[PDB]
């Protein structure tokens, strides 16, 4: 009956005539609560996964914080209006339309230095829960190979550096044309060069969310 419901949020969402409440780890009526914790209002938050694990210093990365009971029952109705996501002392702004009681989505702000083991604090009105697995990284391109290629494009361009797999998405480009990705990793980004109509040199520009990174010029030989 009342134990049909599995989460604290779902438990307090049950219709009033059923008279269900949350008893620490179980949804049950008050007469069967054996701890002094039975409630129809209180729901403490809990995180178990956060992806992606890291963002470039410029930020712009949209996080996805999976967990339980991120909401707040105001006036006997849950919403995420009381929900606050703190990345350290700054806040990640929530997207309500893509968020729910058990999963949150929020865009991180800028950082000035690298930070490792950053703490994600989430308050839901009743309590707070912490998550120390996030990093502000600073992606760098150490080199590119080869330094030149045909105007036909299709050259296997290898970018080399660190933290090149942080954040939401990679966009390498050269000459204003897209350099289509082959493989992504912390240290290596492989991509095939676009076909140019001009014989000249171009810098290889890498885009990671709001972060921009340039490197050595790449010549298009004729």
């Amino acid at each position, epitope marked *: 009956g009342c134990r049909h419901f599995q989460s604290c949020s779902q438990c307090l969402s049950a219709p009033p005539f059923v008279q269900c409440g949350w008893c620490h780890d179980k949804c049950v009526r008050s007469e069967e609560c054996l701890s002094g914790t039975w409630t129809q209002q209180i729901c403490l938050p809990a995180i178990y996964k956060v992806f992606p694990n890291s963002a470039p210093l410029e930020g712009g990365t949209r996080l996805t914080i999976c967990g339980w009971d991120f909401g707040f029952r105001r006036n006997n109705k849950f919403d995420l209006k009381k929900t606050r996501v703190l990345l350290g002392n700054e806040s990640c*702004t929530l997207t309500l*339309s893509e968020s729910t009681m058990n999963t949150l989505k929020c865009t991180v702000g800028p950082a000035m230095n690298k930070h490792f083991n950053m703490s994600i604090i989430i308050s839901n009105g009743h309590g707070t829960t912490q998550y120390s697995t996030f990093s502000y990284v600073d992606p760098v391109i150490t080199s590119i190979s080869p330094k030149y290629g045909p105007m036909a494009g299709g050259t296997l361009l290898t970018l080399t550096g660190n933290y090149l797999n942080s954040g939401n998405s990679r966009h390498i480009s050269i000459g204003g044309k897209t350099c289509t990705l082959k493989s992504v990793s912390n240290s290596i980004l492989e991509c095939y060069t676009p076909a140019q109509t001009i014989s000249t040199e171009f810098a290889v520009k890498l885009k990671i969310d709001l972060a921009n990174r340039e490197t050595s010029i790449f010549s298009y030989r004729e």
Partner: antibody
Amino acid sequence: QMQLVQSGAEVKKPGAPVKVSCKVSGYTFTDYYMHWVQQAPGKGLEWMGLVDPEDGETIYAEKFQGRVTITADTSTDTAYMELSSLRSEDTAVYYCATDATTPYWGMMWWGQGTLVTVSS
Amino acid sequence: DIQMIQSPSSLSASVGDRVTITCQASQDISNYLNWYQQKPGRAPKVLIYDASNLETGVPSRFSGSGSGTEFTLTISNLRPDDFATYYCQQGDSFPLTFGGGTKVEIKR
């Protein structure tokens, strides 16, 4: 129906503080958030920030961060909006608004507005 | 950061016309959008919640539709009191942003 009764028009010198009040009646003041909204002459609506009357929490827009202070007196069912250090730019009608029961943010109820002119 | 873009900024219409007002959002806001009406000298009043639901008291001549990033406010059977400024507003994320406004005016 609900009443958001705001205070009257203001004429402050530049640099002076101003405090606009918003007394409410018709519902329980602590149940809902309270937005404040700015409207410069001939211009659109612009969200300033909000307050949760139940605990006193505030959320400001970046543009008014540090300069505006929204407060809420639960003893008199009144929300205040103080703007320290007025600039000439700050001449505008200021609205207070009750937050909607929708899952998302919205302005359910509105006050009549308060003209704060700023001139030397 | 989410930017609401209304179009047109103004339009002319005779009484009894079907007016249509559009509203673009820079990001997908689902149906988390409100329309307001502001006549000169007065505070705005809510017209529509959830992009399509009329507020209690609003005539059925009004209707909103759209989802994600594109929204409309249609005004069938235009009436003299409908000449006013209309604003869209997203409530999906901070800061809360309004559109630039659409002024409906009497055609002459």
